[PDB]
Design a protein around this motif. Structure first.
Motif, PDB file in Angstrom:
ATOM      1  N   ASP A 256      14.309   0.902 -10.025  1.00  0.00           N
ATOM      2  CA  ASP A 256      14.764  -0.344  -9.435  1.00  0.00           C
ATOM      3  C   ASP A 256      16.291  -0.241  -9.425  1.00  0.00           C
ATOM      4  O   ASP A 256      16.961  -0.596 -10.402  1.00  0.00           O
ATOM      5  CB  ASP A 256      14.280  -1.544 -10.268  1.00  0.00           C
ATOM      6  CG  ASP A 256      14.287  -2.854  -9.483  1.00  0.00           C
ATOM      7  OD1 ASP A 256      15.193  -3.065  -8.649  1.00  0.00           O
ATOM      8  OD2 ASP A 256      13.374  -3.681  -9.706  1.00  0.00           O
TER       9      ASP A 256
ATOM     10  N   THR B  82      20.546  -0.711  -1.091  1.00  0.00           N
ATOM     11  CA  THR B  82      19.997  -0.553   0.245  1.00  0.00           C
ATOM     12  C   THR B  82      20.972   0.269   1.083  1.00  0.00           C
ATOM     13  O   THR B  82      22.175  -0.007   1.099  1.00  0.00           O
ATOM     14  CB  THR B  82      19.719  -1.925   0.945  1.00  0.00           C
ATOM     15  OG1 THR B  82      18.703  -2.636   0.228  1.00  0.00           O
ATOM     16  CG2 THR B  82      19.228  -1.732   2.378  1.00  0.00           C
TER      17      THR B  82
ATOM     18  N   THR C 100      16.272   1.338  -1.151  1.00  0.00           N
ATOM     19  CA  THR C 100      15.555   0.839   0.003  1.00  0.00           C
ATOM     20  C   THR C 100      16.362   1.367   1.185  1.00  0.00           C
ATOM     21  O   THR C 100      17.593   1.379   1.148  1.00  0.00           O
ATOM     22  CB  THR C 100      15.475  -0.704   0.031  1.00  0.00           C
ATOM     23  OG1 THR C 100      14.704  -1.165  -1.086  1.00  0.00           O
ATOM     24  CG2 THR C 100      14.795  -1.181   1.301  1.00  0.00           C
TER      25      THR C 100
ATOM     26  N   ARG D 278      10.841   1.480   1.059  1.00  0.00           N
ATOM     27  CA  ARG D 278      11.257   1.849  -0.281  1.00  0.00           C
ATOM     28  C   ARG D 278      11.117   3.359  -0.471  1.00  0.00           C
ATOM     29  O   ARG D 278      10.092   3.950  -0.109  1.00  0.00           O
ATOM     30  CB  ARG D 278      10.400   1.094  -1.301  1.00  0.00           C
ATOM     31  CG  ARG D 278      10.818   1.247  -2.751  1.00  0.00           C
ATOM     32  CD  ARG D 278      12.064   0.461  -3.118  1.00  0.00           C
ATOM     33  NE  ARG D 278      12.333   0.575  -4.552  1.00  0.00           N
ATOM     34  CZ  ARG D 278      11.693  -0.097  -5.508  1.00  0.00           C
ATOM     35  NH1 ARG D 278      10.731  -0.965  -5.207  1.00  0.00           N
ATOM     36  NH2 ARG D 278      11.975   0.150  -6.780  1.00  0.00           N
TER      37      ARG D 278
ATOM     38  N   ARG E 146      10.138   5.728  -2.546  1.00  0.00           N
ATOM     39  CA  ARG E 146       9.268   5.988  -3.699  1.00  0.00           C
ATOM     40  C   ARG E 146       8.966   7.467  -3.907  1.00  0.00           C
ATOM     41  O   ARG E 146       8.110   7.837  -4.724  1.00  0.00           O
ATOM     42  CB  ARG E 146       7.948   5.224  -3.555  1.00  0.00           C
ATOM     43  CG  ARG E 146       8.115   3.733  -3.471  1.00  0.00           C
ATOM     44  CD  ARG E 146       6.799   3.010  -3.596  1.00  0.00           C
ATOM     45  NE  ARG E 146       6.941   1.564  -3.415  1.00  0.00           N
ATOM     46  CZ  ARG E 146       7.229   0.698  -4.385  1.00  0.00           C
ATOM     47  NH1 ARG E 146       7.424   1.114  -5.631  1.00  0.00           N
ATOM     48  NH2 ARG E 146       7.289  -0.598  -4.113  1.00  0.00           N
TER      49      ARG E 146
END
Ligand SMILES: *[C@@H]1O[C@H](CO)[C@@H](O[C@@H]2O[C@H](CO)[C@@H](O[C@@H]3O[C@H](CO[C@H]4O[C@H](CO)[C@@H](O)[C@H](O)[C@@H]4O)[C@@H](O)[C@H](O[C@H]4O[C@H](CO)[C@@H](O)[C@H](O)[C@@H]4O)[C@@H]3O)[C@H](O)[C@H]2NC(C)=O)[C@H](O)[C@H]1NC(C)=O
Ligand SMILES: *[C@@H]1O[C@H](CO)[C@@H](O[C@@H]2O[C@H](CO)[C@@H](O[C@@H]3O[C@H](CO)[C@@H](O)[C@H](O)[C@@H]3O)[C@H](O)[C@H]2NC(C)=O)[C@H](O)[C@H]1NC(C)=O
Ligand SMILES: *[C@@H]1O[C@H](CO)[C@@H](O[C@@H]2O[C@H](CO)[C@@H](O[C@@H]3O[C@H](CO)[C@@H](O)[C@H](O)[C@@H]3O)[C@H](O)[C@H]2NC(C)=O)[C@H](O)[C@H]1NC(C)=O
Ligand SMILES: *[C@@H]1O[C@H](CO)[C@@H](O[C@@H]2O[C@H](CO)[C@@H](O)[C@H](O)[C@H]2NC(C)=O)[C@H](O)[C@H]1NC(C)=O
Ligand SMILES: *[C@@H]1O[C@H](CO)[C@@H](O)[C@H](O)[C@H]1NC(C)=O
Ligand SMILES: *[C@@H]1O[C@H](CO)[C@@H](O)[C@H](O)[C@H]1NC(C)=O
Ligand SMILES: *[C@@H]1O[C@H](CO)[C@@H](O)[C@H](O)[C@H]1NC(C)=O
Ligand SMILES: *[C@H]1O[C@H](CO)[C@@H](O)[C@H](O)[C@H]1NC(C)=O
Ligand SMILES: [Cl-]
Ligand SMILES: [Cu+2]
Ligand SMILES: [Cu+2]
Ligand SMILES: [Cu+2]
Ligand SMILES: [Cu+2]
Length: 559
Positions: free
Chosen positions: A29, A33, A76, A128, A130
């Motif tokens: 987290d 962005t 992001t 996102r 990931r």
């Protein structure tokens, strides 16, 4: 954002995040962005890198490729795509990016969205990061990416081997003078042509005039360099090698693998390999060779020796003097020797071939046009104006036959898929099978034989079940379906959505070679946010209003 990623310890990233962290279920987290704006323009009579002027190209921000998307693991990525093409709609697909619970941002027109209308239409994709590694993006509007709507993605994260310098992306692609739509029309009734040239990092020398330049990579002596090799082609499958150097694979597609030292690598269309090259040899200029194997079954070029120059810093300039030895013929097959760092285990003894888990690929020569590719008796043909997501949002389950919907209701379970390559057909070609939204496990394939041999194999449980590997097999988004044989894949149903599973050869997917895995439809409707639903509808209303004014018809599948 990293806190412990150093040249000697590339395994470390941040607190609780390293090379051993299961990235598919755990994500940093960062709260950051990274934003980009893609302005697609239609340029006529454009001067290409090899000196030849192309009739028409479709570019992002006025360059051969779009900007290199760079972000960290957990960030992001946000991209506003403004379509300023004259007639064409567009949809940017983020190849290798799983779109975990963000199916509507996949960029698959006629599946996850309607195309963004031309003359100023826009849509903002948001996803996102990931997964860390090397991926790419491209248009999914027919074969539009063959005109230049392509680019790279580099999501920084940890690695399975220490290295000093990250040389970044190195996209290798076939290059045709003819536009994508003219080539789609050509391949509908003719065998695919050889590429006019092969660009390495957006450049090549013309084999006839000598114009243009070779890609020049400067290696620092005595250092370990990470090179992110991509195959962003429409058809060509490459074999790559560097004279007098080995390449140590640290990632296959966007999946980190244990260090695997090789002399050469096969890259199917859409495949990527992050390699570590040690500048251990004598200071000189060395050829990075792009060659073809499989006896032209998966491509070829009119440039007989596409190459790049790997220059050692401090060494003299000029062209390399050692032509080297030709690499081993990879026979249009990617290596199944790669073993992911984060393991996966699946039972292979329990597999039984049934119609509901079998995907028969077939070339149908009986209709109009001649080259029509069918999966389970149907060539895919999506509705740009009525995507699968529209059926989901309206509660309509009457999906037309041409959408090739393979509904998978299983919740977070391993599903097995046997893809058969026209075994009983007149001739069979190798196919780079790609899956949207997931990385699949390559459980096995038919015996490795010469790609042009026309040797056929049908899955026989008595000899083939023992040939399958379920103990940490290759995990990636693209792999080869052998010519005349079969391929057994598996993916866990952890991502509700409409996911395309297709051959990445533009001419074949245009010709219909694809299915659409409608994964957990009941769960998908609940997970679609109001913002995603409203925007999907906005773009679809704008596209539907635009379509009747388009002077050109849809000549292919639309994918
Ligand atoms: C996305 O945007 C692209 C770019 O504009 C569009 O691509 C064009 O699509 C049209 C329609 O399919 C193409 O036009 C057709 O071209 C055929 C081949 O011509 C080319 O090749 C020959 C041989 O090398 C050259 O001599 C010629 O100069 C071209 O390069 C023609 O055979 C077709 O003719 C027939 O149909 C037309 C249209 O109905 C009639 O007017 C004719 O009388 C004849 O019956 C036709 O002209 C065009 O070539 C494509 N251009 C490019 C650059 O690819 C896409 O259509 C568009 N996609 C969508 C869905 O909007
Ligand atoms: C690929 O890129 C590298 C790095 O930009 C180029 O290397 C550079 O090559 C030039 C020669 O072309 C070197 O210039 C020096 O010039 C002096 C004066 O003429 C001469 O005495 C030196 O021996 C040397 O030639 C320069 O130092 C070198 N740079 C580095 C950092 O290595 C290379 O030329 C490029 N290759 C191609 C084919 O474009
Ligand atoms: C890696 O790429 C390099 C650069 O493209 C390749 O070098 C090229 O090698 C070919 C021969 O294999 C050379 O062409 C030949 O030239 C002789 C002239 O003596 C001619 O008689 C032959 O008919 C042929 O045309 C070419 O000149 C050379 N390119 C350069 C600029 O040096 C190399 O072969 C590739 N290596 C591998 C393993 O693929
Ligand atoms: C391929 O198409 C065949 C139809 O020809 C499908 O087979 C049927 O599958 C259902 C299960 O959904 C069974 O109840 C029927 O008995 C099957 N019929 C046949 C042909 O025996 C098959 O599901 C399709 N395969 C895929 C994965 O799309
Ligand atoms: C896109 O680029 C073209 C050409 O540079 C320019 O004319 C146009 O204004 C740009 N559109 C947007 C909204 O960025
Ligand atoms: C690829 O090309 C870009 C733009 O010309 C350049 O900045 C980059 O260093 C090149 N990559 C390599 C590995 O040479
Ligand atoms: C459901 O979808 C089918 C296929 O597009 C269409 O014919 C039918 O009208 C739809 N039903 C409605 C009105 O929602
Ligand atoms: C590769 O290049 C070196 C230059 O240092 C040359 O001496 C060597 O013989 C070549 N490698 C081999 C053994 O083919
Ligand atoms: Cl993907
Ligand atoms: Cu792709
Ligand atoms: Cu994809
Ligand atoms: Cu194919
Ligand atoms: Cu796709």
């Amino acid at each position: 954002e990293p806190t412990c990623n150093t040249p000697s310890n590339r395994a470390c990233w941040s607190d609780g995040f390293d090379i051993n962290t299961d990235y598919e279920v755990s994500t940093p987290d960062t709260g950051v962005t990274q934003s980009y704006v893609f302005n697609l323009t239609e340029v006529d009579n454009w001067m290409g890198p090899d000196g030849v002027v192309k009739e028409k190209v479709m570019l992002i921000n006025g360059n051969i490729m779009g900007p290199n998307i760079v972000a960290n693991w957990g960030d992001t990525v946000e991209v506003t795509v403004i379509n300023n093409l004259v007639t064409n709609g567009t949809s940017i697909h983020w190849h290798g990016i799983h779109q975990k619970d963000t199916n509507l941002h996949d960029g698959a027109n006629g599946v996850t969205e309607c195309p963004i209308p031309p003359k100023g239409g826009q849509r903002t994709y948001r996803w996102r990061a990931r997964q860390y590694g090397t991926s790419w993006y491209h248009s999914h509007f027919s074969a539009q990416y063959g005109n230049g709507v392509v680019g790279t993605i580099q999501i920084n994260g940890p690695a399975s081997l220490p290295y000093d310098i990250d040389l970044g992306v190195f996209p290798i692609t076939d290059y045709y003078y003819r536009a994508a739509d003219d080539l789609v029309h050509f391949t509908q009734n003719n065998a695919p042509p050889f590429s006019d040239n092969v660009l390495i990092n957006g450049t090549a020398v013309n084999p006839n005039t000598g114009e243009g330049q070779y890609a020049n990579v400067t290696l620092t002596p005595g250092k370990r360099h990470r090179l992110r090799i991509l195959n962003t082609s429409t058809e060509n499958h490459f074999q790559v090698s560097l004279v007098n150097h080995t390449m140590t694979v640290i990632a296959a597609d966007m999946v980190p693998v244990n260090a695997m030292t090789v002399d050469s690598l096969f890259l199917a269309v859409g495949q990527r390999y992050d390699v570590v090259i040690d500048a251990s040899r004598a200071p000189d200029n060395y050829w990075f060779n792009v060659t073809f194997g499989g006896q032209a079954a998966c491509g070829g070029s009119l440039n007989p020796h596409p190459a790049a120059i790997f220059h050692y810093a401090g060494a003299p300039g000029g062209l390399p003097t050692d032509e080297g030895t030709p690499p081993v013929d990879h026979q249009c097959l990617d290596t199944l020797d790669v073993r992911p760092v984060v393991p996966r285990s699946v039972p292979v003894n329990s597999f039984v071939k049934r119609p509901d888990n079998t995907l028969p690929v077939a070339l149908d020569l009986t209709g109009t046009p001649l080259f029509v590719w069918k999966v389970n008796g149907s060539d895919i043909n999506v509705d740009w104006g009525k995507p699968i997501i529209d059926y989901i949002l309206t509660g309509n389950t009457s999906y037309p036959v041409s959408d090739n919907i393979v509904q998978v209701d299983a919740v977070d379970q391993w599903t097995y898929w046997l893809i058969e390559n026209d075994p009983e057909g007149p001739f069979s070609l190798p196919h780079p099978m790609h899956l949207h939204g997931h990385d699949f496990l390559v459980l096995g394939r038919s015996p490795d034989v010469p790609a042009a041999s026309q040797q056929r194999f049908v899955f026989d449980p008595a000899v083939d079940l023992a040939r399958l590997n379920g103990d940490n097999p290759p995990r990636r988004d693209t792999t080869m379906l052998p010519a005349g044989g079969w391929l057994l894949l598996a993916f866990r149903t952890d991502n509700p959505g409409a996911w395309l599973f297709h051959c990445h050869i533009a001419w074949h997917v245009s010709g219909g070679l694809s299915v659409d895995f409608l994964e957990r439809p009941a769960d998908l409707r609940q997970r679609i946010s109001q913002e995603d639903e409203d925007d999907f509808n906005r773009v679809c209303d704008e596209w539907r209003a635009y379509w009747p004014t388009n002077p050109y018809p849809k000549i292919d599948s639309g994918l």
